[PDB]
Amino acid sequence: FDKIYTQGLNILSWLKHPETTPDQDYLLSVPVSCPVICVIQLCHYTITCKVLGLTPGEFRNSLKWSTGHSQGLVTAVTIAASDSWDSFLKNSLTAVSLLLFIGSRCLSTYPRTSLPPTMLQDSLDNGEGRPSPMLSVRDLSIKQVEKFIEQTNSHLPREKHIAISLINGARNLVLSGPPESLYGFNLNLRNQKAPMGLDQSRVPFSERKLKCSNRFLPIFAPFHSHLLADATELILDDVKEHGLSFEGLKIPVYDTFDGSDFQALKEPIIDRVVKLITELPVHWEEATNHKATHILDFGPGGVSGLGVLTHRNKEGTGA
Amino acid sequence: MKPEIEQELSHTLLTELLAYQFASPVRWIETQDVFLKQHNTERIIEIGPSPTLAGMANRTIKAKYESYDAALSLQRQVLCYSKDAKEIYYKPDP
Amino acid sequence: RTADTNPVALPFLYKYNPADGFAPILEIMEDRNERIKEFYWKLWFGSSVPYSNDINVEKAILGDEITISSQTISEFTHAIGNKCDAFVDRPGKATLAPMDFAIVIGWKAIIKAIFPKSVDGDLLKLVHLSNGYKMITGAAPLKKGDVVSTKAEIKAVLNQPSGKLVEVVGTIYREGKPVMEVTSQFLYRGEYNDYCNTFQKVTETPVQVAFKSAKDLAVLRSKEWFHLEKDVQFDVLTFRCESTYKFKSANVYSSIKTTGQVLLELPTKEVIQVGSVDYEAGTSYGNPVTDYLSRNGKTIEESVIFENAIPLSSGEELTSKAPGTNEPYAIVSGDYNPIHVSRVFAAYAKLPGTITHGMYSSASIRALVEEWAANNVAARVRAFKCDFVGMVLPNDTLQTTMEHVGMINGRKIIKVETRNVETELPVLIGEAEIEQPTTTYVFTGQGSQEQGMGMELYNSSEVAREVWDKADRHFVNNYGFSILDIVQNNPNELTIHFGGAKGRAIRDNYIGMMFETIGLKSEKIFKDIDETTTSYTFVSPTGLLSATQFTQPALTLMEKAAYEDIKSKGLIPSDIMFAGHSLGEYSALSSLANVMPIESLVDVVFYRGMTMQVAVPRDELGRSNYGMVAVNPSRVSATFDDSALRFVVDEVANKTKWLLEIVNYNVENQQYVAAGDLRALDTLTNVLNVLKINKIDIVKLQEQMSIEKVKEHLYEIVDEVAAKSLAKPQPIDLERGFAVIPLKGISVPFHSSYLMSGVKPFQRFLCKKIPKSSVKPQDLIGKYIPNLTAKPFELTKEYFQSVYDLTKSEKIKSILDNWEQYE
Amino acid sequence: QVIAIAKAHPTFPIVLQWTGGRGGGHHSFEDFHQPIIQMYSKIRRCSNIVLVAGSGFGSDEDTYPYLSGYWSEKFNYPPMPFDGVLFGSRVMTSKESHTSLAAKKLIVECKGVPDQQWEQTYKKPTGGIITVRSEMGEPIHKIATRGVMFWKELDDTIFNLPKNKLLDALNKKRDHIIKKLNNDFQKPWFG
Ligand SMILES: Cc1cc2nc3c(=O)[nH]c(=O)nc-3n(C[C@H](O)[C@H](O)[C@H](O)COP(=O)(O)O)c2cc1C
C-alpha cells in the first residue's frame, strides 16, 4: 500500500528521531492509526506481563475474560490466543497485519474528504470539534438521539444516511455517516439545545432545554457503518492471501455486537472481527454485561480512554 | 443567425417583454424557482433600499428548497445591499 | 528510482594529473552538460526512449495522449494531501481531477523544453523558479475518462545575472479544444553569454484603447506600426499583440518584432479586425507598441485591489508539514529528479538536503487555497500561480497566510504566502484567481422610497456620483427638476417653470407624452399643459418620493449606482443570472446588459410611472376606484394553496364581472398580490375572512363534489360579500384582513390586464429609447430572466411562442411566422 | 450539601429524603429520577446517608421498584435500591387526619396522572391538581378548586407585574377581583 503510506510507516524512526515524525493528520490517518494503536495496546500488555514477571499465557490465566472497543477486539483476541512469548509475538504480528489491512481498505473504500471551512470553523467555534465521520453525543437517551437522527436523515438519501455505530452506554453514543450529515445533526441538536450556561433551576424539567456534549471524534473513517461494507470482502481477501488467523483461545472473548463468546464461534475469528470492525455497531453495555470485580483498561487515552467510560457505565456495580 | 439578425431578434423580444411586463403578472415564484433550482445559485444579492426580495427568496428557500439544498450540500447566502454591504463588497470589519 | 526501474549512472570524468599535486583532479568539462542531459533524459523519459537534443525551440513540443483514471486521480490526490470531495469517486457525480494534475499530464512536454542544444546549462543546478496554471474561459475542469494531449512551447530563454531563465507554457487539450495553460520557469544557475540563442515571446494581454478625441485618432494614425485595413469609424479598439524579442546583450534587443490584430466591436456587436500592428526594429531598448498600449490603454479585466486585505483562515489551520520522503510525489508526478530523493545527488548539487518538490509545495498550498478560499469547490479556482522563493527540506513546518486582496472580472484574487516556521524565511509566494459562488443579481421594484436613499453611496463613491449626476443633469435639462433634490429633500410640491428656450423644450417634452385607455382613446398625460402654460405643479400629500413618476427613477438610479459601484470594484461574476421585480427589471437590464443608457433609463422609468399614474380614472379629489392587496393563503388556512387562490380569484372575477386578478406571484402559498377594483378587492378580503371562519377547504370541495356544487357554495359567499362591498360607500377603503393587507399609497392595478390598453404607447416609447445597437444578446442569453416568462432569455422559437401566448403581440407574431428566415 | 454534611459526620446517620418536583405541596422543578441517577453513587459513597424516596408514592406495587432498585433498569442503569419511602399526599384522606370530609372527597375525586405528565400542572389542571405560586415565589401543588384557579389567574395577571404597575393594574381589575373573591376564594371582600 505504498500509494497510501506516503510518509512511510517506520514507527521506530519516529520514536528514536522525533524530528522525523509525520504530522498529526498522517498519524491520525486510519491506516496508520489502527496498527499503531494496536502496537500501543500490545506494548501495554507486554509491559504489564514483564513487569509482573509472567509469560503472556500466565497473565492470561489470571483474566476471567477480555473484550475490546472497536479495534481493541483484535488485541483482546491476541491476548486470548497467546500462551508463550513466541505465540504472543506471532499473534501480535498477525493482529498488526490485520489492522493494517483494515485501515488501508477502509481508507480506500471511504477516502478522507475535507468539509467546507465555513462549516469547519463554525463547528470549532461552537465547540463541536473538527468535522469527521464519527460524532460522539452524550447525555441524551437512545430515543432522543434516534429522533434527531430521523430529523436529519429524512432530508438525505440512503447513501448519506446517518446510522448508530457505537452504543457506548445509556448517555454515550457515537453516530457514523458523512461528516456533512453529522454536521447537520449537530446544527439541529444545537437548535434544540440549551444555551451555554442557561439558568433553568426555576424552569420546569419538561421545558428545560438539552444539556449534552456533541463533539466530533478524531476518527477519519465511518467505522461500523454500511459505508465500509464493501471493504469487508477486500480485507477477507487480504487475510486469506496472507494466511492470517487466530486460534486456541483460552478465555472468553465476547462479541461487541451480539455478545456471543468467540470461543463458541464456528466461523473464522478474523472474518467475524473484520465484520464487526467495518459493519456491525458496538453494543458496549451488552459486551461488558458479564461478571467482573476488576477491569484493566489497556487502550489509549488514559483518563480520556475507554476505562473512565467503562467506569461510568459500571459505576457501583462492583467493577 | 448572423449577429445582426440575432441583435434584431433580441431587441424586438426585449422591447416586447418590457412593454407587456407593464400589463402582465410578475411571476416571481417561477423566477425564484429558475435560479434557485436550475441554476443552483448560491449568492443571491438583492440590490435595493430594503431586503424585500432577500426575505422572499429566504422564504422560498425554506419552503421548497430546504431539503434540496441539504441534499446537494449547497449553502445559499442571501444578501441585501442595504444590510450586508460589507459582505457584498468583501469588506469585513478589521 | 527511475521511470523504468532500471538503474542509471551519471558519469563524471576527471583527468588525473600527478604532475600537479596541488590540484591533481581536473574535471573534463567537455560534453559534461550533454552527459548530464542524457542522464536526466533517461530518468524522466526512460532508458528505452532514445536521447535526442535536436529540438527546435521555435516549434511546439507534442506530448503523449493520456487518459485520466480514478486510480491515478486518487493516488495523486493522496500523495499531495488534497482532501477535496470533488476528487473522490462518488457515483453519479463525475469525479474531477485536481488542477495540479496538469503538471502530471504535461511533465514530459514541459520538461522536454530545457533539453534543446540552444538551451545549454547544468541540469543539476537547474531550479524550478515558478509554476502557474490558468483555466481557459468556459473550460470545464478535468474529469475522469478525459483524453488529454499536451502541447508545450518555449516562451522565453534569457540570460540574467543569476543564470539562464527558461519559460515553458504547456497547453492541455481535451477533444482538440484547449482546457488550460501551465506556465513553468526553470533557471540554470551560472553565467551564460550565448545571447544568440535567447528570445522572449510575450503574448500581451488585450488592451482596450479609447479614442475619444481627434488627437487620439491623430496619434494612432501617426504610429507607423499601426495599419488600418478596414476604413470604419471606431471609438474603442482592442489590441491583441504577440511581441518577440531577441537579445544581443543583457539590456539590448537584437531584434523586436511585434505582430497584432486590432479589433473593433461594431454596433451589431460583431467583433472584426479593423487593422493590424506590425513593428520591426533592430537594436532597441524597449517595445513602443507595448509602451503605447500601457500608457494610453487599459487592459481588459483590471485587477481592483481592496483597501484592506482580508485574512482567510488562521496560522493554526493553514500550517502544514512537508513529507519525510519525496518518493510518493516523485512517482505519481513523474518528476524523478534525484535532487529530491538521493542524498548523494543533493550533496553534489551543494543543496542542504533532499529538498522536497517545489511542485509538491505548490500542490499543498493550492489544496489549502481550494479548501479555504474556494470553499472546497474545485471548479471555482480558475488560476493559481506560485514562485519558489525558498527551499524546503523533509519534515519542515510551513506556515501559510492567505489574503483576499483584490478582484479581477469578479474573480477573487488570493495572495498566498508560505514561510518556514523554523527559520521564518519565505518559501512560496503566489496568487490565485477564484470564481465567486454562482450568483444571481436581484433588483427590487417599488415599495421603499425613503428620503435620502443611496446618498451614502453618492457621497462615498465617485462612480455613484457620476450615475446620479448624469441622471440629475438629464432630468434638469429635459424635465425641469432635480431627482437629487427630490430624493434628498422629498418636497410635498414641486413647481416646474417652462420659460426660456430650454423651458419650452421641457414643455414640449411634457406635452409629447401620450397615454391610451379604453373609450383605444389616446390623449395627453398632462391635459392642462398646452402652448400657453407657464408652469406646472406636482403635488403629493405624502411627499413626491411616494409619487410613482418620481419613485421609479429614484429607485432605478440608486440601484444603478449600487451596481456600478459593485462593478467598478470588480465583484460581478462573468456567469451571473440577473432578474428584476416589476420596476427592478429596468434597473437590472441597464445594469448588467447596458441596454439602456442612464438618460434613456430615467426617461423610460419616468414615462412608466406617469403612465401608471394616469392609467386609471380619478375623481375631483384624485381618488381612484382600483387598488392592490397582498394576500397570504397560510393565514386563511394551512391547506389553502396557490391553486386554491387561483380558483377563488377566477370565481370572484367571473361572478361579479369586476376586474380582480393575481398580479405578483411572490412566494408559494405565503405571499401573493391581487389587483382590481376596490369593490372586488374588499370582496376577496371578506370572502377569505368568511372562508376561514367557515373552515371550508375548497380543495376537498373540488375533490369530493362537482364543480357545480363548489361553485354553488363559493358563489353564495361571493353574492353576500359583494352585496356588503356595494353597501360600503364608494370608493371602498380596504381593511387589513387576516390574510389580506392592502397596499397603502397604491391607486393603480398594474401588472393586470387593465394596462393592456396602455401597453402600446409604452411599446413605441421603448422602441425609441432602446437603440438596436445597445442590445448585447450575449449578455442576455441564459443570464436575463424576465418577469413575463420567468425563464432565461432565449432566442428560440419555443421562447417566442411562450411570449406570444401571453401577449398576442403583432411583432412576436411576425417573428414566429417568419422564423424560417432566422433558422 | 447533604453529602458534605455526611462526610463531615461519617458516624451520624443523615436521612436524605429525596422528593421530586411531582410531590404535593411545595415542590422543586427537578425530575424525581435524573438527579438521583447522577448523585446516588456519590450519596452511597457515604455509608451514613439513608436515602428515602418520596414525591408520588401511595402503594406497594408502585413503591417496590424504588425499594428494590429495579426502577433503574428502565433507564439502562444498574439496580439502585432506596433505603425507604416517605408518604405525603397519600395519608391526607386518613381517618385521623383533620382534613375536612369535603376536602377528602374532593381528593378522592382527583384522579391524578402518571409521572410522564405531572409537569403540565404548570399550565393547566392535571387530574384536578394545578401549580400555583406562593408569596415567596416557590411553586405549590394544589387541588384545582375555584379559589386555586383564581390564585392562578392572579399570579398570571397581577402578582407577576412590577410594583410600580401593580397598583394601576389592581385599580383596573378592581371589580372583577372583588367579585371573584366573594364568589370563589376563601377570603371574601370585607367591604
Ligand atoms: C399538605 C402538604 C404539606 C406539606 N408540607 C411540607 C412541609 O411543611 N415541609 C416540607 O419539607 N415538605 C412538605 N410537604 C411535602 C411532603 O413532605 C412530601 O415531601 C411530598 O408531599 C411527597 O409528595 P407525594 O404526596 O406525591 O408523595 C407537604 C406536602 C403536602 C401535601
CATH number at residue A101: 3.40.366.10
d(C-alpha C102, C-alpha C135), whole Å: 10
- Which of A191, A220, A249 corresponds to the end of one domain? A220
Same domain, residue pair A190 and A239: no
Determine the residue of chain A that is closest to B69 in CA distance: A155
Comparing CA positions, the residue from D50, D5, D51 lying closest to residue D32 is D51
Torsion angles phi and psi, residue D141, rounded to 5:
-85, 125
Q: Which residues of D touch A138 (CB under 8 A)?
A: none
C797 CB within 8 Å of a chain B CB: no
Question: Residue C423 to residues B20, C278, C400, D106, D141: CA-CA distances in angstroms?
Answer: 69, 51, 14, 86, 72
C-beta contacts of D86-95 below 8 A and 24+ residues apart: D86/D17, D86/D19, D86/D52, D86/D53, D86/D54, D86/D57, D87/D54, D87/D57, D87/D58, D88/D19, D88/D23, D88/D24, D88/D25, D88/D54, D88/D55, D89/D23, D89/D24, D89/D58, D90/D57, D90/D58, D90/D59
Cβ C84 vs Cβ C97: under 8 Å: no
Specify the pairing of strand C298-299 against strand C199-210: antiparallel
Q: Based on the number of CB atoms within 10 Å of its own CB, is A92 exposed (0-12), middle (13-18) or buried (19 or more)?
A: buried
d(C-alpha C80, C-alpha C322), whole Å: 10
Give the residues across from C167 on adjacent strands.
C156, C185
Q: Report the run of H or E that residue C165 belongs to, with start and end.
A: strand C163-174
Specify the pairing of strand C25-27 against strand C14-16: antiparallel
Cβ D17 vs Cβ D26: under 8 Å: no
CB contact under 8 A, B22 and C608: yes
Same domain, residue pair A259 and A169: no
Which amino acid, residue A79? I
* H helix runs in C203-308, sequence order: 214-222, 288-296
C320 CB within 8 Å of a chain A CB: yes
How close does chain B come to C133, measured CA to CA in Å?
25
d(C-alpha C636, C-alpha A37), whole Å: 63
Breaks (C-N over 2.5 A) in chain D follow: none
Question: Residue B82 to residues B50, B51, B88, C482: CA-CA distances in angstroms?
Answer: 6, 7, 10, 24
**Taking the C-alpha atoms of A281, A286, A288 and A290 in order, what is their torsion angle to the nearest 10 degrees?**
-150
Which SS3 state, helix, strand or coil, does residue A171 take? coil
Neighbours of C696 (CB within 10 A): 18
Q: Which residues of A touch D41 (CB under 8 A)?
A: 315-316
Torsion angles phi and psi, residue D85, rounded to 5:
-135, 130
Between vectors from CA C263 to CA C258 and to CA C269, what angle results, nearest 5°?
165
Q: Based on the number of CB atoms within 10 Å of its own CB, is A24 exposed (0-12), middle (13-18) or buried (19 or more)?
A: exposed
Comparing CA positions, the residue from C131, C796, C769, C812 lying closest to residue C513 is C769
Of chain B residues 32-61, which have a CB less than 8 A from chain A? none
Query: Ramachandran region of residue B86, left (φ > 0), alpha (ψ -120 to 50) or beta?
Result: alpha
Asked if chain D contacts chain C via 3 or more Cβ pairs within 8 Å, the reply is no
Task: Tell me the residue length of chain D.
Answer: 191
Comparing CA positions, the residue from A289, A293, A297 lying closest to residue A313 is A289
**Strand order in A163-169's β-sheet?**
A215-216, A134-138, A172-176, A163-169, A282-283
Cell digits for A272?
467475524
A295 CB within 8 Å of a chain B CB: no
Neighbours of A42 (CB within 10 A): 23
Same domain, residue pair A93 and A179: no
Query: Ramachandran region of residue A197, left (φ > 0), alpha (ψ -120 to 50) or beta?
Result: left
Which amino acid, residue C754? Y
Comparing CA positions, the residue from A149, A162, C590 lying closest to residue B18 is C590
CA C24, C28, C33, C39 torsion: positive or negative?
A: negative
Cell digits for C321?
508539514
Same domain, residue pair A122 and A215: yes
Which amino acid, residue C761? P
Specify the pairing of strand C439-443 against strand B43-47: parallel
Comparing CA positions, the residue from C287, C422, C331, C268 lying closest to residue C777 is C268
**Experimental technique used to determine this entry:** cryo-EM
Our mutation pick for probing the ligand 1 site, out of D22, D26, D145, counting the most ligand atoms within 8 A of Cβ, is: D26
- For chain B, the distance separating the N- and C-terminal CA atoms, rounded to the nearest angstrom, is 52
d(C-alpha C148, C-alpha C131), whole Å: 20
Cβ C447 vs Cβ B50: under 8 Å: yes
Query: Can A70 be counted among the known catalytic residues?
Result: yes
Number of domains in chain A: 2
Cell digits for A146?
434516534
Which amino acid, residue C213? S
How close does chain B come to C415, measured CA to CA in Å?
15
For C492-542, the fitting CATH number among 1.20.810.10, 1.25.40.10, 6.10.60.10, 1.10.10.10 is: 6.10.60.10
Asked if chain D contacts chain A via 3 or more Cβ pairs within 8 Å, the reply is yes
Question: Residue D77 to residues A314, C755, D111: CA-CA distances in angstroms?
Answer: 8, 75, 31
CA A87, A91, A92, A93 torsion: positive or negative?
A: positive
DSSP assignment of C542-563 equals T-GGGSHHHHHHHHHHHHHHHH
- Max CA separation in chain D (angstroms): 62
* H helix runs in B3-93, sequence order: 3-21, 28-33, 52-64, 66-72, 85-89
Question: Residue C760 to residues B20, C283, C514: CA-CA distances in angstroms?
Answer: 9, 68, 11
Domain containing A142 equals 113-220
Please list, residue by residue across B5-25, b when 16 or more beta carbons sit within 10 angstroms of its beta carbon and e when fewer do: ebbbbbbbbbbbbbbbbbbbb
CATH fold of C191-302 reads: Lipocalin (2.40.128)
Instruction: Give all chains having 3 or more CB-to-CB distances under 8 Å with chain D.
Output: A
d(C-alpha C789, C-alpha B30), whole Å: 9
Q: Report the run of H or E that residue A8 belongs to, with start and end.
A: none
d(C-alpha A1, C-alpha A5), whole Å: 6
Cβ C484 vs Cβ C468: under 8 Å: yes
Our mutation pick for probing the ligand 1 site, out of D19, D92, D126, D138, counting the most ligand atoms within 8 A of Cβ, is: D19
Question: Residue A157 to residues A150, A154, A178, B70: CA-CA distances in angstroms?
Answer: 12, 8, 11, 10
Q: Report the run of H or E that residue C156 belongs to, with start and end.
A: strand C147-160
Q: Which residues of C touch A120 (CB under 8 A)?
A: 317
Query: What CATH class does C30-190+303-436 carry?
Result: alpha beta
B77 CB within 8 Å of a chain C CB: yes
Instruction: Give all chains having 3 or more CB-to-CB distances under 8 Å with chain A.
Output: B, C, D
Which residue lies with its CA nearest to atom 12 of ligand 1? D26
Q: Which residues of B touch C269 (CB under 8 A)?
A: 3, 7
Cell digits for D138?
416557590
Which SS3 state, helix, strand or coil, does residue C227 take? strand
* H helix runs in C617-729, sequence order: 633-636, 642-656, 678-694, 698-704, 707-727
Return the beta strands (E) in C36-95 as ranges: 61-62, 66-67
d(C-alpha C357, C-alpha D112), whole Å: 78
Which SS3 state, helix, strand or coil, does residue A107 take? helix
Cell digits for C649?
380569484
Instruction: Give all chains having 3 or more CB-to-CB distances under 8 Å with chain B.
Output: A, C
d(C-alpha C479, C-alpha C509), whole Å: 7
d(C-alpha C144, C-alpha D175), whole Å: 83
Half-sphere exposure of C38 (CA within 13 A, CB side): 11
Same domain, residue pair A18 and A107: yes
**Taking the C-alpha atoms of C797, C799, C805 and C807 in order, what is their torsion angle to the nearest 10 degrees?**
-110
Task: Tell me the residue length of chain C.
Answer: 823
Same domain, residue pair A142 and A216: yes
CA C44, C49, C51, C56 torsion: positive or negative?
A: negative
d(C-alpha C812, C-alpha C807), whole Å: 9
Same domain, residue pair A65 and A185: no
At how many degrees (to 10) do helices C707-727 and C678-694 cross?
Answer: 120
Instruction: List the CATH code of the domain at C787-823.
Output: 6.10.140.1400
**Taking the C-alpha atoms of A183, A184, A186 and A190 in order, what is their torsion angle to the nearest 10 degrees?**
140
CB contact under 8 A, B66 and A155: yes
Same domain, residue pair A297 and A277: yes
Torsion angles phi and psi, residue C199, rounded to 5:
-165, 165
CA A99, A101, A107, A109 torsion: positive or negative?
A: negative
B92 CB within 8 Å of a chain A CB: no
Give the residues across from C342 on adjacent strands.
none
Between vectors from CA B57 to CA A124 and to CA B14, what angle results, nearest 5°?
135
Q: Which residues of A touch D76 (CB under 8 A)?
A: 142, 169-170, 285
Comparing CA positions, the residue from C102, C99, C128 lying closest to residue C114 is C128
CB contact under 8 A, A285 and D40: no
Same domain, residue pair A143 and A179: yes
Catalytic entry in A66, A70, A123, A136: A70
d(C-alpha A92, C-alpha C614), whole Å: 93
Between vectors from CA B72 to CA B70 and to CA B76, what angle results, nearest 5°?
65
D76 CB within 8 Å of a chain A CB: yes
Q: Which of B66, B67, B73 sits opposite A180 (nearest CB)?
A: B73
Which amino acid, residue C277? V
Same domain, residue pair A154 and A16: no
Question: Residue C509 to residues A168, C513, C556, D12: CA-CA distances in angstroms?
Answer: 83, 7, 21, 105
d(C-alpha C97, C-alpha C174), whole Å: 13
Q: Based on the number of CB atoms within 10 Å of its own CB, is D162 exposed (0-12), middle (13-18) or buried (19 or more)?
A: exposed
Query: Ligand 1: which residues within 6 Å by Cβ?
Result: D 19, 23-26, 54-57, 87-89
Same domain, residue pair A251 and A161: no
State how far Cα A263 lies from the chain centre: 22
Q: Based on the number of CB atoms within 10 Å of its own CB, is D137 exposed (0-12), middle (13-18) or buried (19 or more)?
A: exposed
Comparing CA positions, the residue from C39, C38, C62 lying closest to residue C52 is C38
Same domain, residue pair A215 and A235: no
Cell 425499594, located at residue: D67
At how many degrees (to 10) do helices A179-191 and A142-153 cross?
Answer: 120
d(C-alpha C277, C-alpha C279), whole Å: 6
d(C-alpha C642, C-alpha C672), whole Å: 9
- C270, C313, C440, C751: best mutation site toward chain B, by most B Cβ within 10 Å? C440
Which amino acid, residue D75? F
Torsion angles phi and psi, residue A42, rounded to 5:
-65, -35
- Which of A220, A249, A264 corresponds to the end of one domain? A220
DSSP assignment of D23-86 equals SSEE--SS-SSHHHHHHHHHHHTSTTEEEEE-SS--SHHHHHHHHHSGGGGGGT------SEE-
Cβ A253 vs Cβ A276: under 8 Å: no
Give residue D154 CA to ligand 1 midpoint distance, Å.
24
Give the residues across from C170 on adjacent strands.
C152, C182
d(C-alpha A203, C-alpha A205), whole Å: 6
Please list, residue by residue across C433-470, b when 16 or more beta carbons sit within 10 angstroms of its beta carbon and e when fewer do: bbbbbbbbbbbbbbbbbeeebbeebbeebebbeebbeb
For C618-745, the fitting CATH number among 3.30.565.10, 3.30.930.10, 3.40.630.10, 3.30.70.3330 is: 3.30.70.3330
Between vectors from CA D39 to CA D37 and to CA D41, what angle results, nearest 5°?
90
Between vectors from CA C262 to CA C258 and to CA C267, what angle results, nearest 5°?
175
Question: Residue A205 to residues D21, D29, D74: CA-CA distances in angstroms?
Answer: 9, 6, 19
Query: Ramachandran region of residue C550, left (φ > 0), alpha (ψ -120 to 50) or beta?
Result: alpha
d(C-alpha C570, C-alpha C690), whole Å: 54
d(C-alpha D166, C-alpha D158), whole Å: 7
Cell 394544589, located at residue: D142
Which SS3 state, helix, strand or coil, does residue D107 take? helix
C581: Cβ–Cβ under 8 A, 6 or more apart, which residues?
B26, B28, B52, B53, C442, C443, C444, C445, C664, C787
How close does chain D come to A207, measured CA to CA in Å?
9
A86: Cβ–Cβ under 8 A, 6 or more apart, which residues?
none
